[PDB]
Structure formats: structure tokens, C-alpha cells
Write a protein that binds this ligand. Structure first.
Ligand SMILES: O=C(O)Cc1c[nH]c2ccc(F)cc12
Length: 115
């Protein structure tokens, strides 16, 4: 259950982004993890997503919500560096250039609170 950055070294994370640049150049490499203090939402099956660079962030919110199989009642937020991405109808390619990690991944966190 450890976070991605505790399972992979910085150099290995950089090499993985570089490999994705070669093999899936039109995809943004995204890490999506459950907030550490999250109580209500389940853990997602997978952590690493290759997102076509034209996808709007607001659509990624809907996709992850569907993957979690929640009621329309359960609150859900997907955050990039504590910015909620529910209303961001901007392609991920633009968010990437602005919010990417030094290792080249784009890190997101989901929670039942937007704090
Ligand atoms: O969910 C995934 O597996 C990765 C992903 C996120 N958004 C997408 C949009 C189109 C597509 F082909 C794949 C994706």
C-alpha cells in the first residue's frame, strides 16, 4: 500500500517517464493515489495511468469516479497539488507542463473531501 515514490527511486521514476515518452509519446504519465487519511473511498485497482494528452481534466475526474464504482451520493474529489480538478475543462497536456513533478510524472490524489 506504499506510495509510488516509496516504491521507486527518483532515477527509476525518471527512466520510466522517458520510456513512456518513447513508447506512448501522446500520453501523459499520471500517478493517481488515494489520500493518506481517506476513510470512505476504496483503494483503486491501479495507480499508473497513461492519459491521452487531449483529455480534459474534468473528464479524467468522471473517469476515475466511474472506476471507483460509487453511488451518486458519495463525495469524490481528484486533486493535483491540492487543486480540485472537477471544473477544469483544460486538456491534461496543458496542466502537465505546469504541474508535473521533477521526475516527469503528474501526481494526483483523490479523497472524499476537498479540504
Ligand atoms: O483509465 C485509463 O486506463 C487511462 C486513461 C485515462 N483517461 C483516458 C482516456 C482515453 C484513454 F484511451 C485512456 C485513458
Amino acid at each position: 500500500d506504499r506510495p509510488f515514490k516509496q516504491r521507486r527511486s527518483f532515477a527509476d521514476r525518471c527512466k520510466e517517464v522517458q520510456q513512456i515518452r518513447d513508447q506512448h509519446p501522446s500520453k501523459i504519465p499520471v500517478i493517481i493515489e488515494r489520500y493518506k487519511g481517506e476513510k470512505q473511498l476504496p483503494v483503486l485497482d491501479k495507480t499508473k495511468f497513461l492519459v491521452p494528452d487531449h483529455v480534459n481534466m474534468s473528464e479524467l475526474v468522471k473517469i476515475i469516479r466511474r472506476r471507483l464504482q460509487l453511488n451518486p451520493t458519495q463525495a469524490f474529489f481528484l486533486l493535483v497539488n491540492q487543486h480540485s480538478m472537477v471544473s477544469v475543462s483544460t486538456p491534461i497536456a496543458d496542466i502537465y507542463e505546469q504541474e508535473k513533478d521533477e521526475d516527469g510524472f503528474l501526481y494526483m490524489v483523490y479523497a472524499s473531501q476537498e479540504t
